[PDB]
Design a protein around this nucleic acid. Structure first.
Lengths: 177, 84, 107, 93, 97, 93, 104, 83, 95, 198
DNA sequence: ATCGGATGTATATATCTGACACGTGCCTGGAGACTAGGGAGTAATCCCCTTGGCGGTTAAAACGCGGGGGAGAATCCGTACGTGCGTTTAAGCGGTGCTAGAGCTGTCTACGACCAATTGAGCGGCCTCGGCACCGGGATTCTCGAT
DNA sequence: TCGAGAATCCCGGTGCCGAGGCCGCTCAATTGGTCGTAGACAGCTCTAGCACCGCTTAAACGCACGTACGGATTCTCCCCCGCGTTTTAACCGCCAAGGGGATTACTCCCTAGTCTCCAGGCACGTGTCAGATATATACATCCGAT
């Protein structure tokens, strides 16, 4: 969000490590995590969560993975940093591809929250598939659309949730060379 | 989809650090020196570029100009001439 | 009557009116006396003349008729007081002085 | 639009010191940066001087004290001289 | 087969790169490095040519000065070979670490 | 005459973070000097920010950018946060 | 009802506004700058005083002397980076002896 | 006529310099260190006191106050708190 | 009698846990007045002025001694030498 | 002089080696002095002057050592080493170093010379509204060769250098002191004359 | 290694004392209620300069190998520095006494801000030529292995 | 310390693009006033900086003795330099698209300004309690004897 009137439907929730927090004094060795809750139905977006956004620049829609949550930058009250996915037409139409290319998302383009699984979970759950909600991610490649390296997407979710962004980004960069 | 930039710190080649040291009057260079120099240069550039992008963002611009680098350097006590 | 620039009354080349304007509107004080711009412009002109003299000597030593930044770096770093004034200052395209330690020399 | 500089003044002083000697654009921009840096330094020191003494005006005395604070050694002396002369001429006209 | 002793070509390179002012790092790798460092602050940034040129000027200046101090630190240990310990000491006295 | 300081406010803050803790007069003067030093640093940086962009006003935006330039690490985070809270209350009352 | 009371702070928003207006920093000063600036100063004072109170209780003293301030500042990384070129009087130094100089 | 203050740099005694070095984490001290330190301190005080006296004279005063010393120290990048 | 070095380390710990000034007040005040005599004649000093001067000088010298001790250890030594101080002041930029 | 009109009866003249000036840029040392225009009286470095000390009530002789120019309070400062009058010396120190307090005062006031001054390593800034005339300083031999024609207001002699307290006399050639003041910079000359008596 | 003596230190408790925390009068600075002139928000448009691409050259980078020599380890000697102990010195203190000068005040004047008319100084654009870059050819100055 | 080989240096020739001079042409510097107040300045108050005296005793100085540390010295291993060969991607010239940097114009929001009103915070004063100081008592540590 740029202004304060651009996130009226949302709310910023702060957590110590896993429990809820609502405080000021910089505590020693306690890094605070942030996420944002849409009050319309209490939808929570934090690090690791993959979302679907309306990409009006391409005419289609794009899928991202929230990596970092900058609060109160010197231009945007909230900056949503996310890794980009490569859709099917940039290389099964519900198989995505992770990239280290980052992007800044604005909340007014949010649609739903993508359910990303691997190959085993994709074969296990074939009869109950939703085209606009469930996706599978097996590889990670470059933004150009080549050099595919298979990786468990659940482990990547956990690692983005755990380690700091400035380290995981460089980690994902050197995974394809 | 812009071109992915990775491992560009390796672009500071060994002969480049060698030339920089030769200008500094260094006769013999240890092997581990080059990696240390790459790290130190990365730290320096990170600080300067973070301050310059702060200046550019304050001006509500998307193009980092030379005056931003000059202001960041002068803020860090590294006043630079020849660019304004 | 007829106009007369303050730079002519002071006998200087640097602009006294421009220095006065930069001092009054530069957020330095509430007001600026009429003697501050003259004094400041004179000091600036003197320091410019010092730099330019040493750099012109450095340019003539290379038998070149135009001052390049390398000449400025030579002029600044070979003068003790000018190098002390421009300590934390980097002159782009200036290079370094020809200096090698004693121990690094061949024996 | 117009953006001013000290190019013509530096060129005048150069022709004074070295009549048939030129200067490149990079060195010209370096000279302009130097003039602006010295200006900022002296004017800031004089500003803090006047603010210390509960004074509201920047007189040439503040510029002189700032010069003696900043410029080292003989550079100060001559500079003060070159300042005083100018003042004594301007105050005479 | 004519062959110079170890150290002669080193001193010749010192003299060769001390009498000139050209940038000693390759330009395009440095520009790509600057862009890779800046992409972590704001996405899809643009740079004036003068911006990356001033960055490279300041970077090479800082590295040359640090190398002078590091060579002084190596000589202080009665050595002629700069070592990471010398760089660490130099940046410790300067206050950079 | 009266020469003011930041004593009573630092005392309130100390009693808020540590209710049963006093402070010596020398440490009091140290805290006052620290407050004034940080103030002049942030104000100078905001002034430079406004002057670079050809603006004539020190808005809260310049203060926030100056804080992000001067305060390092997590201090820069929390401080910004605190700066945003006060403003939010001030525009409400 | 002072502006410091309206913004929920302890530092004087009015005095900070006066100092910004008459400190020769800019022609005009917005009414939101003193609030933000005082809030930041309050956070910094709070951080230093809480770390100093911790160090003072660890020294079994209920009054904060400059030594507690120096300990709190030099033991905190970001505070020490904030006061790098700054000298705290009557603060001494942190106890640190190089590992080379330990007896054998 | 006050008694001539002469070679008061020698008043920085050897035990005092030794204490200063002990605070700085020094275990063994050479002989030339003492005169070297006297010279270093003399240059330091020369610069700082020259600036402080410039501040005092600019205020048209004859007494060097604490504010002059604090302003000189700040001007030399050695900001001092407490005064 | 202790080995040479034990009393020195005890001095280190004592003077690191304390914050008192390590130089006598009156000789330092005389030094300040002698130095100022070459700048202006018949100057006066508040007690706080000379005290701030002494605090600044002691901080400067102790920090310089820490850097000098590092300069001595870098050369595989445990004794500070004048070349260590000179190198430290050179790296700092005071030279 | 504080302001310009405080030197209105004087004029500042600078010479580099021998020739005069009416420079700007530095060069690879200039000397300054001031001339009273009513009679062309030149005061430079090493010159001895007599000043009206309105604190003691009598007068006091000084030796110009430095000529600070364009300070932040005075346009011209006149730094000078001080002399010691015959009544500003210690009789006990002279009676113990060379060989009841009133008796030594008697011995000194009766036996000493009224015009014998002594140098000091202490200096005092002088102002031109207390200047009378230029003093002529002799040595040990010239004072005895010139005994008949001695102007009591223009002729003095100095043999010893001592501290301002008036003890620990040390003799030195005063003409050599006049030469040494003009030869070397004041920072070193004052130090040398200071450590001559410790 | 293990154990006793000696040394200085961490530690427990108690005792002054002067520095700190709070009470009080008050006055000068901050708030409330308006107004106004301009700075800043915001949209529209010109156009500059940033991004990107492609092909060919080749100069720099990368790799590898012989080997000189430099870093590092281990040794030996002299001496410079640490550690106590007794003697010498003056720092520190705790008062008095004074007076130079910091500090506050009450004018009153000269000097600087502010605004309107005028222009020529300093700006941006336009050639254009010569100082300098580029390249080659021959001379000079080293370097290094040995008669 | 004498020649063969190899870097650099200096000079002649050719071409180029950037430094310089000049042309209008906006606009800011000048001129010419008026008016407001900042500070120059003499005077009074009175703060505190200078000077001093003697006493105590902690600090500094000098000296004896010994040891451990710095510095010189020899030897050795491997690592970094010189140089040759192969590979690569920097670099230059030329071209095209358009993103976003400036500039302009209109509007209106905001902050300086003032006048009045009052209370927040400071100078002053006072009592009293946490820390500097002290004495003594375990206790860790050092260091040599065994």
């Amino acid at each position: 969000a740029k202004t304060l009137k651009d996130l009226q439907g949302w709310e910023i929730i702060t957590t110590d490590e896993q429990g809820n927090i609502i405080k000021r004094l910089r505590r020693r060795g306690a890094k605070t995590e942030h996420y944002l809750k849409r009050s319309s139905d209490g939808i929570k977006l934090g690090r690791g969560d993959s979302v679907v956004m309306h990409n009006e620049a391409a005419g289609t829609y794009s899928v991202y993975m929230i990596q970092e949550l900058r609060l109160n930058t010197i231009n945007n009250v909230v900056e949503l940093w996310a890794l980009t996915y490569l859709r099917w037409f940039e290389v099964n139409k519900n198989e995505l591809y992770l990239t280290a290319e980052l992007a800044e998302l604005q909340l007014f383009n949010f649609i739903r929250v993508a359910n990303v699984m691997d190959g085993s979970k994709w074969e296990v759950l074939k009869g109950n598939v939703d085209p606009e909600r469930d996706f599978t991610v097996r590889y990670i490649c470059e933004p150009t659309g080549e050099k595919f390296v298979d990786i468990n997407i659940e482990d990547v979710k956990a690692y983005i949730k755990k380690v700091e962004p400035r380290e995981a980004q460089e980690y994902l960069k050197d995974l394809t060379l | 989809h812009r071109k992915v930039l990775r491992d560009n710190i390796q672009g500071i080649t060994k002969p480049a650090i060698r030339r920089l040291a030769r200008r500094g009057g260094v006769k013999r260079i240890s092997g581990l020196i080059y990696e240390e120099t790459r790290g130190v240069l990365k730290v320096f550039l990170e600080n300067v570029i973070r301050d310059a992008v702060t200046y550019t963002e304050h001006a509500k611009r998307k193009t980092v100009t030379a005056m931003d680098v000059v202001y960041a350097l002068k803020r860090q006590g590294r006043t630079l001439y020849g660019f304004g | 009557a007829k106009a007369k620039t303050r730079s002519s009354r002071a006998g200087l080349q640097f602009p006294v009116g421009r220095v006065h304007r930069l001092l009054r509107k530069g957020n330095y004080a509430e007001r600026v006396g009429a003697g501050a711009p003259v004094y400041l412009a004179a000091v600036l002109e003197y320091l410019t003349a010092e730099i330019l003299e040493l750099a012109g000597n450095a340019a003539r030593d290379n038998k070149k008729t135009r001052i390049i930044p390398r000449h400025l770096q030579l002029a600044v770093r070979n003068d003790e007081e000018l190098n002390k004034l421009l300590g934390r200052v980097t002159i782009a395209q200036g290079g370094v002085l020809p200096n090698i330690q004693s121990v690094l020399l061949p024996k | 639009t117009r953006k001013e500089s000290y190019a013509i003044y530096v060129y005048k002083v150069l022709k004074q010191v070295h009549p048939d000697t030129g200067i490149s654009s990079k060195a010209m921009s370096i000279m302009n940066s130097f003039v602006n840096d010295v200006f900022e330094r002296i004017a800031g020191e004089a500003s803090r001087l006047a603010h210390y003494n509960k004074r509201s005006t920047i007189t040439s005395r503040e510029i002189q004290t700032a010069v003696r604070l900043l410029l080292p050694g003989e550079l100060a002396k001559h500079a003060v001289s070159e300042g005083t002369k100018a003042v004594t001429k301007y105050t005479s006209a | 087969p004519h062959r110079y002793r170890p150290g002669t070509v080193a001193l010749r390179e010192i003299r060769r790169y001390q009498k000139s002012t050209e940038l000693l790092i390759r330009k395009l790798p440095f520009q790509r490095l600057v862009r890779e460092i800046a992409q972590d602050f704001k996405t899809d940034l643009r740079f004036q040519s003068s911006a990356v040129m001033a960055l490279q000027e300041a970077s090479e200046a800082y590295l040359v000065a640090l190398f002078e101090d590091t060579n002084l630190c190596a000589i202080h240990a009665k050595r002629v070979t700069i070592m990471p310990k010398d760089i660490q000491l130099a940046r410790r006295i300067r206050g950079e670490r």
